Design a protein around this nucleic acid. Structure first.
Lengths: 65, 225, 129, 156, 126, 65, 88
RNA sequence: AGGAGGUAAAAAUGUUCA
RNA sequence: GCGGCCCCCUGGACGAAGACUGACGCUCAGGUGCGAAAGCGUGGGGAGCAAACAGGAUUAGAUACCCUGGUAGUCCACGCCGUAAACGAUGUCGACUUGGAGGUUGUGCCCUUGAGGCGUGGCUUCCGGAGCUAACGCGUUAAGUCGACCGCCUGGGGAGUA
C-alpha cells in the first residue's frame, strides 16, 4: 500500500493495491448491510465455481477441436 | 484355437484403466492394485476366451456373417487388417446408429454406394464437371469410411465382435434388441453385462488387439472350412 | 433396536438377492435357524453354515436357477407390531400355493402345506413367494 | 499360479521402447503397459530440420509436460553465449535458493541475498523477474545462476 | 496447578527498576508454592505501532505453574499499577523452556556460513 | 502448494516471529491457505497467534499508525 | 467434569474392586455427586441453557438407572437412596 | 489459466362469448 | 443459532487399547423446558443504521422506488410473547444393499528411508448404479429394501376464520 521505489522509477509501478484489496472490500462494504445474501452469494460463489471445475473436467470430446 | 497366458502376459493385457474410472460390475475380474491401476486375473480370461472361441467356432461353421467394430484410432487399422484376412465385414471408423435396428433404411445408402462404385469405374465422372465429380467423389469417400466394409453384408450379421464396451455402447445395445449374440472385449471401466460373452482384458494395447483379432481370425477362418 | 430380528433376517435375504451375493451373514438364533432349516428343505437356499461360539454368525448361501435370483418376493407378515394368528381352516395359500407360507406351530416351524396334512392351525410368520 | 508370473514380472524390473508405427507428426512407441505411448517428432528432430529414427529402433523415453526433459538438449547452443531466460524462485533452504528455470533447479547462494539488513527484506519470496546465466552444468542436471547479474534482477 | 505464561510490557522509565519489580511478583508466587520457570527479558525493543504515544517498549516473560487463586490476585497488581502496559495470560499444555532469544539465531547462523565454506571445499576436493 | 510444520510437527508459538512474519502481506493481512495450502489444523493456530501477536504489538495491524 | 481425584474416592467407595466402574450403584452414585457439583454453577448465571440441556440429560439418565435398580433388587434400591440421599 | 473496477430516469391499461 | 483476543465455571461428541454392569432399550398423546427476528414491560445507554414523520424531486397522481434529515427500535440487565419459506420444504431409532472425486478431525503398521505407501473410525460436500418416483430428482447423511413408534391429511374457496 506504501510504494516509493527510491529514485529510478519514473512511473506508478503500483499494482499492490488492486493486488491486495483497493475496492475489492471498499466497493463491497461501500454499502448494503446484507447480513443474509452474503451466505447466498457465498454459497453460489463456489457453487457455480465447482461447475467451471466439473464441466471442464468432462468437457473433452470433439467439437472438432 | 488357443494362445498362451504368456503371449497375453507379454502383450500387457492385465493392464487396466485408472482405478478411479472402473465400473463396479467388473468386480470379479479385478486382481489387485499396482501403481493405483486395476489389474486383471487371467485365470478367468483364458477359459472364458476358450469359451469365446468355442462359441465362435460353431457360428463360423454355419457360415454366419461376421462383424468386427472399433472406433478407436489405436486399434482402428487393426480391424481392417484382420477383417480382410478373415474375409468378413467390419466397421473401423464411424459407428452409424441403427446399423442393425434401422438396417432396412441403410440399404438405401448401400445401393446408393453401388451406384457410386460403377460410375466411378467406367468413369461417368469423366463426363461430369469438377463440382459434380468432386461433389460425388468426395461423397464416395464419406460412404467408404462408413459403409465401406459392409457393402456385401445385405442383412443381419449373425455374430458381433466389439472392442471397448462403454465407448461402443450403441452397437452392443442394438445387438441386444435384435437378439444377435455379442462377443466383446470388456474393460475395467466398461459395463460387461450388455454382452453375452465378455473377455476381460485391455483394449488400448495395439499389439494385444492384434493378439485378439488375429486369434479371432484363427477360429474364424477355420470355421469357413 | 432391531425390534424384529425375524424380518431383519429376511430383509438380508431380499437385499442379498438384489446384490447377487453368494453368502449372507447375520446374528444367529434358534428361531433364526428353524426358518432357514425349512428353506434348506424346500430348496430356496443352498445349504448354510453356523460359525462361532458365543456370537454364532448365521450365514446362508443363495441359489440361482437362471441369471436372475430364485426368490420372487418374501413378505414378513406377522410383525411384532401386529401379530397374525390363523385357524387351521384359514391357512392361506400364497401364489395358489406354489409359493410357500412359512408358519410356526406347536409341532414346530414348518410349511403350511405340511400343516394341513398335520391338521392344525398356527402363527403365520412370512410368505415366501 | 497366475500371481506367480506377475510375481516374476516385478522381479524383471525412464522407459525403453521400440518404434513400430510412424505416421507423420506422430510416433508410436511400445513400452509394455496397457497402452503404447505416442511421442511427437519434436523430440526426435535434429538441428538441421529432419528425423533421426526408423521403425525397429530401440529409443529412450521418459514421461506436453514431459517432452521437456529431453528437449533441454536444444538449449545448449543458447547457454554457450550467455542466453538470457526467465524464471521464478519457489524453493528455499539454508542459504540455497532453488529457481525453476525452464524446469531446471537453479542455485543461488545468500552471499548477496541476505547481508546487512537495512529494512524489511521481504521482496525475495514471491518475486518474478528475469535472471541471466553464464555457466551451465549438464553433469549435475543443474544451472547455477551468476552473481554480477544482480544488477539486472534487482532493479532492471 | 495450571501452567501459565504471563507476558507484559513496562514503560521505559520504570524499566530500569523492573528487575527489582520482577523480584516482587515472583516472590508472592514463591509463597503460593508456584514454581516459576521462564524469566526471559527481551529488553526494550521497538514496538509495532504507537501504543499510548511512546514507542520502544520493554518486554518480560514468566510462564509459571501456580494455583488459580494467586494468579488472579496477582492480576490486579497489573491493571491498577500505572507502570504495566498491556499484560496478558495464556493456557498450559506442558510448560517448556528455550525458544526465547532470537539474537543468537542470527549470530550462530553467521558462524554456520563459515563452516558452510568448509563444506564447499570438502565438495571440490573430497 | 507446499506443506508446513506438518513434517516438523510442533505447537505454533507466537513468541518467535521470525518464521511468523512470512505469513502476512505488507498491510499485515493474513495470507489465506489457498495460497500456502497449509493444513487447516496449523492454519488456525497460526491465525490465532497472528492475532495474539497483534495484541502484543509485534506485528502491526497495518502500515498506517 | 468431576476430575479423576473425586471419582477415585466414590468408585473406591461403592466398587467391589478398583477396576469395577460399571456397577449400577457406581453410575447412579457418580452422577448424584456431579449434579450437586453443578448447583453452584446454576446458583448464579441460569442463562447457560445449553449447559442445562446437558444437565437434564443426566438427571433423567440417573432416573432410568434408579428406576431399573428398583425393578431388580429392592434391597439395594432402598439401601441406596436411604444412604446416597435423594428422592425426597 | 486465476481475481477486481466501470455499464439500463420514466413508458399504465386493453369490455363479453366463440 | 453461534465467529477479535483473554481469564474463570461448565455441556456434549469423537478416537485408542483394556476393564465393568448386564437388556438398565426404542419411540412417545397429555405435561415440562428450549426456541431467530419483530413487538411489549422496568431501568440504563443511544454512535452508525433506521420504521413512522417531514422536506426536495420523480410522476397523470406518488401518502412508493431516489435524496437530505430524522423518533421508536436495533445494544445491556431482569422478565413476557412462543410465532417464520423455524426448509437438506424430507419426524425419531435400528439393521441391510455396487463406487468415484474432496474436505475435516483421530488412529495403527511399514523404511521418517523425501511434500510419503497401505488399512481402519466419527462428521460432511458434489456427481452418479441398482432400485424407486407422477416427473423433477434422491441415491449408504436415501424418497432404496424392511421393522418399531408418534403426529398429520382426505377437493379449492369459506379459513387456518367465527
Amino acid at each position: 500500500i506504501k510504494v516509493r521505489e527510491n529514485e529510478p522509477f519514473d512511473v506508478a509501478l503500483r499494482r499492490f493495491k488492486r493486488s491486495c484489496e483497493k475496492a475489492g472490500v471498499l466497493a463491497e462494504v461501500r454499502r448494503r448491510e446484507f447480513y443474509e445474501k452474503p451466505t447466498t452469494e457465498r454459497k453460489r460463489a463456489k457453487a457455480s465455481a465447482v461447475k467451471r471445475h466439473a464441466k471442464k473436467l468432462a468437457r473433452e470430446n470433439a467439437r472438432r477441436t | 484355437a488357443t494362445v498362451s497366458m504368456r503371449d497375453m502376459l507379454k502383450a500387457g493385457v492385465h493392464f487396466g484403466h485408472q482405478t478411479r474410472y472402473w465400473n463396479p460390475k467388473m468386480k470379479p475380474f479385478i486382481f489387485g492394485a499396482r501403481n493405483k491401476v486395476h489389474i486383471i486375473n487371467l485365470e478367468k480370461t483364458v477359459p472364458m476366451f476358450n469359451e469365446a472361441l468355442a462359441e465362435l467356432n460353431k457360428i463360423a461353421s454355419r457360415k454366419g456373417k461376421i462383424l468386427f467394430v472399433g472406433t478407436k484410432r489405436a486399434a482402428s487399422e487393426a480391424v481392417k487388417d484382420a477383417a480382410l484376412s478373415c474375409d468378413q465385414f467390419f466397421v473401423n471408423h464411424r459407428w452409424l446408429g441403427g446399423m442393425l435396428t434401422n438396417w432396412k433404411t441403410v440399404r438405401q445408402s448401400i445401393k446408393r454406394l453401388k451406384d457410386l462404385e460403377t460410375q466411378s469405374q467406367d468413369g461417368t465422372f469423366d463426363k461430369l464437371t469438377k463440382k459434380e465429380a468432386l461433389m460425388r467423389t468426395r461423397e464416395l469417400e464419406k460412404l467408404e469410411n462408413s459403409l465401406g466394409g459392409i457393402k456385401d453384408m445385405g442383412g443381419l450379421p449373425d455374430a458381433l465382435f466389439v472392442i471397448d464396451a462403454d465407448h461402443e455402447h450403441i452397437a452392443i445395445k442394438e445387438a441386444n434388441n435384435l437378439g444377435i449374440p455379442v462377443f466383446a472385449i470388456v474393460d475395467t471401466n466398461s459395463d460387461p453385462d450388455g454382452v453375452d460373452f465378455v473377455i476381460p482384458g485391455n483394449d488400448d494395447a495395439i499389439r494385444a488387439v492384434t493378439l485378439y483379432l488375429g486369434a479371432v481370425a484363427a477360429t474364424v477362418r477355420e470355421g469357413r472350412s | 433396536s432391531m425390534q424384529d430380528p425375524i424380518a431383519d433376517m429376511l430383509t438380508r435375504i431380499r437385499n442379498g438377492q438384489a446384490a447377487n451375493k453368494a453368502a449372507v451373514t447375520m446374528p444367529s438364533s434358534k428361531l433364526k435357524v428353524a426358518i432357514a432349516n425349512v428353506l434348506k428343505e424346500e430348496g430356496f437356499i443352498e445349504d448354510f453354515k453356523v460359525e462361532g461360539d458365543t456370537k454364532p454368525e448365521l450365514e446362508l448361501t443363495l441359489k440361482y436357477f437362471q441369471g436372475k435370483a430364485v426368490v420372487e418376493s418374501i413378505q414378513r407378515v406377522s410383525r411384532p407390531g401386529l401379530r397374525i394368528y390363523k385357524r387351521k381352516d384359514e391357512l392361506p395359500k400364497v401364489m395358489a400355493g406354489l409359493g410357500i407360507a412359512v408358519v410356526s406351530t406347536s409341532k414346530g416351524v414348518m410349511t403350511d402345506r405340511a400343516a394341513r396334512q398335520a391338521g392344525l392351525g398356527g402363527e403365520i410368520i412370512c410368505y415366501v413367494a | 499360479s497366475f500371481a506367480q508370473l506377475f510375481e516374476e514380472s516385478l522381479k524383471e524390473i525412464i522407459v525403453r521402447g521400440v518404434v513400430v508405427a510412424i505416421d507423420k507428426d506422430v510416433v508410436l512407441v511400445d513400452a509394455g503397459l496397457k497402452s503404447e505411448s505416442a511421442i511427437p517428432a519434436e523430440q526426435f528432430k535434429n538441428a538441421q530440420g529432419e528425423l533421426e529414427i526408423q521403425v525397429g529402433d530401440e529409443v529412450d523415453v521418459a514421461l506436453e509436460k514431459a517432452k521437456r526433459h529431453e528437449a533441454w538438449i536444444t538449449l545448449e547452443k543458447a547457454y554457450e553465449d550467455a542466453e538470457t531466460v526467465t524464471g521464478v524462485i519457489n524453493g528455499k533452504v539454508k542459504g540455497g535458493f532453488t529457481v525453476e528455470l525452464n524446469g531446471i533447479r537453479a542455485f543461488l547462494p545468500g552471499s548477496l541475498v541476505d547481508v546487512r539488513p537495512v529494512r524489511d527484506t521481504l521482496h525475495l519470496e514471491g518475486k518474478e523477474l528475469e535472471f541471466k546465466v553464464i555457466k551451465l552444468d549438464q553433469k549435475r542436471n543443474n544451472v547455477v545462476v551468476s552473481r554480477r547479474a544482480v544488477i539486472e534482477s534487482e532493479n532492471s | 496447578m495450571r501452567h501459565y505464561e504471563i507476558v507484559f510490557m513496562v514503560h521505559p522509565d520504570q524499566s530500569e527498576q523492573v528487575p527489582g519489580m520482577i523480584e516482587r511478583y515472583t516472590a508472592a508466587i514463591t509463597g503460593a508454592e508456584g514454581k516459576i520457570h521462564r524469566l526471559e527479558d527481551w529488553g526494550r525493543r521497538q514496538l509495532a505501532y504507537p501504543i499510548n504515544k511512546l514507542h520502544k517498549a520493554h518486554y518480560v516473560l514468566m510462564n509459571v505453574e501456580a494455583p488459580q487463586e494467586v494468579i488472579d490476585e496477582l492480576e490486579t497488581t497489573f491493571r491498577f499499577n500505572d507502570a504495566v502496559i498491556r499484560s496478558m495470560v495464556m493456557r498450559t499444555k506442558h510448560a517448556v523452556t528455550e525458544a526465547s532469544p532470537m539474537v543468537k539465531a542470527k549470530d550462530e547462523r553467521r558462524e554456520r556460513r563459515d563452516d558452510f565454506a568448509n563444506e564447499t571445499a570438502d565438495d571440490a576436493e573430497a | 502448494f507446499c506443506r508446513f510444520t506438518a513434517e516438523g510437527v510442533q505447537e505454533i508459538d507466537y513468541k518467535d516471529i521470525a518464521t511468523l512474519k512470512n505469513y502476512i502481506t505488507e498491510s499485515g493481512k493474513i495470507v489465506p491457505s489457498r495460497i500456502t495450502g497449509t493444513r487447516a489444523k496449523y492454519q488456525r493456530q497460526l491465525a490465532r497467534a497472528i492475532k495474539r501477536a497483534r495484541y502484543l504489538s509485534l506485528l502491526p495491524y497495518t502500515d498506517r499508525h | 467434569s468431576l476430575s479423576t481425584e473425586a471419582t477415585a474416592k466414590i468408585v473406591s467407595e461403592f466398587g467391589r474392586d478398583a477396576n469395577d466402574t460399571g456397577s449400577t450403584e457406581v453410575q447412579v452414585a457418580l452422577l448424584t455427586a456431579q449434579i450437586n457439583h453443578l448447583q453452584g454453577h446454576f446458583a448464579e448465571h441460569k442463562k447457560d441453557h445449553h449447559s442445562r440441556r446437558g444437565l437434564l440429560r443426566m438427571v433423567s439418565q440417573r432416573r432410568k438407572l434408579l428406576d431399573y435398580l428398583k425393578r431388580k433388587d429392592v434391597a439395594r434400591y432402598t439401601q441406596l437412596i436411604e444412604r446416597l440421599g435423594l428422592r425426597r
